[PDB]
C-alpha cells in the first residue's frame, strides 16, 4: 500500500490499474480521482502498477474545483468493485471505486467520507477510520 500506514495488510486482488478513475468520497469538493501511481508497486517489465483496497496512490483530479485540480497528490482506496477473497472465506465487492485524498502520512485532506469503507483500509489508516461511517 505505502508508508504512513499503521500495520501490515493481507494481499488482496488488484482492481485498479494505473489510469483508472474512481470517485472522491470526501468533502474536498472533487468529482474524481485519477490514478497515475501506486506506493507498494512491485516493478516488472510491462506490468501496470495496480492499487487495491487500502493502497496508497498518487492521483490528479479531472473533475472538480480548479484549486484542487492540475497537480499531483496522495490518495487512498476505500472501495473497489473488483472482488477479493478475505481469509474468512467470503468473497465480496463494492458498487464502485471510491477514494479519499490524503497527505504523505495518511492524514485526511477532507473531514468526512461518503458511503461505506472496507475494513482492510480502516485498520491500515486509523486517520481514515476516524472520519468514516459504517465499515464494510
Amino acid at each position: 500500500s505505502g508508508n504512513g500506514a499503521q500495520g501490515t495488510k493481507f494481499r488482496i486482488s488488484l482492481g485498479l490499474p494505473v489510469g483508472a478513475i474512481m470517485n472522491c468520497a470526501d468533502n474536498s469538493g472533487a468529482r474524481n480521482l485519477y490514478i497515475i501511481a501506486v506506493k507498494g508497486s512491485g516493478s516488472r517489465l510491462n506490468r501496470l502498477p495496480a492499487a487495491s483496497l487500502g493502497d496508497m496512490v498518487m492521483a490528479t483530479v479531472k473533475k472538480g474545483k480548479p484549486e484542487l485540480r492540475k497537480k499531483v497528490m496522495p490518495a487512498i482506496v476505500v472501495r473497489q468493485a473488483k472482488s477479493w477473497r478475505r481469509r474468512d472465506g467470503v468473497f465480496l465487492y463494492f458498487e464502485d471505486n471510491a477514494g479519499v485524498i490524503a497527505n504523505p502520512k495518511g492524514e485526511m485532506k477532507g473531514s468526512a467520507i461518503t458511503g461505506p469503507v472496507g475494513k482492510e483500509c480502516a485498520d491500515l489508516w486509523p486517520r481514515v477510520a476516524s472520519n468514516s461511517g459504517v465499515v464494510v
Binding site: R79, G89, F91, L92, Y93, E95, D96, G115, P116
Partner: protein, 63 residues
C-alpha cells in the same frame, strides 16, 4: 460458525460460498451462488420467481 441466508433466494448459505455485495449505501446482499446473484443484477423481483423462498410464502405454496 454462521450459516447466513440469501438476500434473494432465501437459500442456505455456507461459509465461503457465493459472494457478498455492498450496495451503494450501507446495504449488504449475500448470494448463495452466481444464479441468484445475476438475477439481482437484472433487477428482478424475488416475489415473481418460482423457486425462491420469498415466493413460496407469497403464493401459499407449501405450508
Amino acid at each position: 460458525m454462521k450459516v447466513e441466508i440469501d438476500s434473494f433466494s432465501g437459500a442456505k448459505i455456507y461459509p465461503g460460498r457465493g459472494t457478498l455485495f455492498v450496495r451503494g449505501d450501507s446495504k449488504i446482499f449475500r448470494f448463495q451462488n452466481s444464479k441468484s446473484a445475476s438475477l439481482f443484477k437484472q433487477r428482478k423481483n424475488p416475489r415473481r420467481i418460482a423457486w425462491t423462498v420469498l415466493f413460496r410464502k407469497h403464493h401459499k405454496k407449501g405450508i
